[PDB]
């Protein structure tokens, strides 16, 4: 039964009929405009004996509908950071870069001048660090003591001050627990942008879909067989 015949035989009024048909048409159009993979086709140079037919089998044969809505709320909390947008998770951390430079210095057995760049974040962080160092001790900090800027993490406050996040949180979902348990996708202590980590399939775990029943020395146990395939896990640090 086709939808058009069902609507024609239905007992609606005209307006509901045309609304229903137009909704179906717009859904079909949106399905058409959504780009994923195309239909398959046969190859051009197929060999022989794919069209030839044996005489026995010859006797066998019988012969915009969707709308965007972003209602802002007045006084909503800040959910982005200027320092956070500069960092990238895939690249190695700043502490790791500092260790790489110290590794190079130790290998060459001589001091190596640091690279110089005109990033605004580095300038702001060095300014704040120098101010705090002069506050705590009545001296200007030495260039060797300015190397702590690379190791630490920095972020703005709500009133515009510059500070250090002492204990960063995981960039994925995690739990801030109090008198009530609550999960936070994003929190001000995160040092990277929020993202969802990837997980393995639940049915490709250590035992395969069909395990084999074996035994220990004197208890029953389980073991895997060829239905279980370990992951590739081809990755290395640095």
């Amino acid at each position: 039964s086709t939808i058009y015949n069902a609507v024609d035989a239905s007992t609606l009024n005209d307006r509901c009929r045309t609304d229903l048909l137009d909704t179906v048409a717009q859904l079909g159009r949106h399905c058409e405009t959504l780009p994923k993979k195309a239909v398959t086709t046969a190859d051009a140079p197929l060999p022989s004996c794919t069209f030839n037919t044996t005489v026995s089998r010859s006797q066998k044969e019988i012969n915009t509908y969707f709308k965007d809505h972003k209602p802002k709320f007045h006084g909503a909390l800040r959910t982005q950071d200027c320092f956070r947008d500069t960092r990238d998770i895939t690249q190695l951390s700043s502490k790791e870069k500092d260790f790489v430079h110290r590794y190079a210095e130790a290998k060459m057995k001589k001091s190596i001048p640091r690279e110089e760049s005109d990033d605004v974040a580095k300038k702001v962080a060095t300014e704040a660090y120098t101010e705090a160092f002069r506050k705590f001790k009545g001296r200007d900090p030495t260039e060797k003591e300015l190397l702590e800027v690379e190791r630490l993490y920095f972020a703005y406050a709500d009133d515009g001050a510059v500070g250090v996040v002492q204990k960063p949180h995981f960039h994925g979902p995690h739990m801030h627990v109090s008198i009530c348990n609550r999960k936070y996708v994003t929190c001000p202590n995160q040092v990277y942008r929020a993202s969802l980590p990837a997980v393995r399939n639940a049915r490709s775990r250590f035992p395969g879909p069909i395990p084999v029943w074996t035994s220990t020395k004197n208890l029953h146990a389980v073991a895997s067989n060829d239905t279980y395939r370990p992951g590739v896990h081809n990755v290395s640090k640095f």
Partner: protein, 430 residues
């Protein structure tokens, strides 16, 4: 409010035999057909699945169909087989050969009128008819072709009722037949047009349920069909017993399907645990909810963590507080909030029923609408594309008479279904 069941092919007949065992146990029907129950609550809705024969007897409102009688001797040999009405068995004289075109066109059109006549005779006897329930495999031959044929005829004849299907689909690993991709693709093409709501099951997930959760040493197809009979008999429980918050198949459909193509659902049933472990853990609503969302207890290979929930429904059986149900569904929605589609403010429906299955204090059945079902279809389409490019076995279908255009249409329709699910799986950048 009576449901009519259709059971097709060997897998369907076996699952049906286990279903009617579970239902007769829950309603206290003797294998002679005599009522032997111990509360009026059992009797007052017996009509839902049984018809009353004269002086005591009850007969089950089911049609059994298959193309070769080999299965009939097995179902006739089962523990409840005598109960079935003789006129309700419609069978041929030679098998489907696992070929969709044979099952659909030659013996399908030959038998289908007698099956439609039996289904109409059964439907018009009800005082008010609820939806049909069909069990079949999609990978087979007579199951896929004749099941979808019958579904199309019943949808022509009863367009205002509900059409619900339970369907078995081939594992990528546990193969039993070479031509599985063709039969699966053509059947899914038929279902996505024809069905109102369809649940899909892979035997590999039931095997993993048996081995990991139940720790069975030597599982058999009877255990898998017992798990399936448990969920199928659980979904209808609110139809046929009192409760604090009644529910119905149509209300489930209205809450589960956001758009009419998105009608493919995953299933689970919670209180599964091995006899050695059972002394270690009591039943409770948090425990049932935790097992209910745990993917180990879910009956498909796709994992929810790779998709997103559009909607879900939980039906609880037993004497329990409504506060715990509501607060559990809130807590689960809040704790896993990234896996729920954000433009719907509440994804879970709850329902509460007073009467649990015999010998359990409580039970829940879970229905979930999640975009990860798209992963099964791409895999089937991959194996189809490998087979189709080389015309690997195509001459059988063309010799029966099929145009290649059916194959290209079915491939395009399934690919559009995958695309529609795929857009909703990944959230927008904003």
């Amino acid at each position: 409010r009576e449901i009519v069941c259709v059971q097709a092919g060997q897998c369907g007949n076996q699952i049906g035999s286990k279903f009617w065992e579970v239902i007769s146990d829950e309603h206290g029907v003797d294998p002679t057909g005599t009522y032997q129950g111990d509360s009026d609550l059992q009797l007052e809705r017996i009509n839902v699945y049984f018809d009353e024969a004269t002086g005591g007897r009850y007969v089950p409102r089911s049609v059994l169909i298959d193309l070769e009688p080999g299965t009939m001797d097995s179902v006739r040999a089962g523990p409840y087989g005598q109960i079935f009405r003789p006129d309700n068995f419609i069978f041929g004289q030679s098998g489907a050969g696992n070929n969709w075109a044979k099952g659909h066109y030659t013996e399908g059109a030959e038998l289908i009128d007698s099956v439609l006549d039996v289904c109409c005779k059964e439907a018009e006897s009800c005082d008010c008819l609820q939806g049909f329930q069909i069990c079949h495999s999609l990978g087979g031959g007579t199951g896929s072709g004749m099941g979808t044929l019958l579904i199309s005829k019943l949808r022509e004849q009863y367009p205002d009722r509900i059409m619900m299907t339970f369907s078995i689909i081939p594992s990528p690993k546990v193969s039993d037949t070479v031509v599985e991709p063709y039969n699966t693709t053509l059947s899914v093409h038929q279902l996505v047009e024809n069905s109102d709501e369809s649940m899909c099951i892979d035997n590999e997930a039931l095997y993993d349920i048996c081995f990991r959760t139940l720790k069975l040493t030597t599982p058999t197809f009877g255990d898998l069909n017992h798990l399936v009979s448990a969920v199928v008999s659980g979904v209808t429980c609110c139809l046929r017993f009192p409760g604090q918050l009644n529910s119905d198949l149509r209300k489930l459909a209205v809450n589960l399907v956001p758009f009419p193509r998105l009608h493919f659902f995953m299933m689970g049933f919670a209180p599964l645990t091995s006899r050695g472990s059972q002394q270690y853990r009591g039943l409770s609503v948090p425990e049932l909810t935790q097992q209910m969302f745990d993917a180990k207890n879910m009956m498909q290979a796709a994992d929810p963590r790779h998709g997103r929930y559009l909607t879900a429904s939980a039906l609880f059986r037993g004497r329990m507080s409504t506060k715990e149900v509501d607060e559990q569904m809130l807590n689960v929605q809040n704790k896993n909030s990234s896996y729920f589609i954000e433009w719907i403010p509440n994804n879970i429906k709850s329902s509460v029923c007073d009467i649990p299955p015999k010998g359990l204090k409580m039970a829940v059945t879970f229905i979930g609408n999640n975009t990860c079902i798209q992963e099964m279809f791409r895999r089937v389409g991959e194996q189809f594309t490998l087979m189709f490019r080389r015309k690997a076995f195509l001459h059988w279908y063309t010799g029966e008479g099929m145009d290649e255009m059916e194959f290209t249409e079915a491939e395009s329709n399934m690919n559009d279904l995958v695309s529609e699910y795929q857009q909703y799986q990944d959230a927008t950048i904003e």
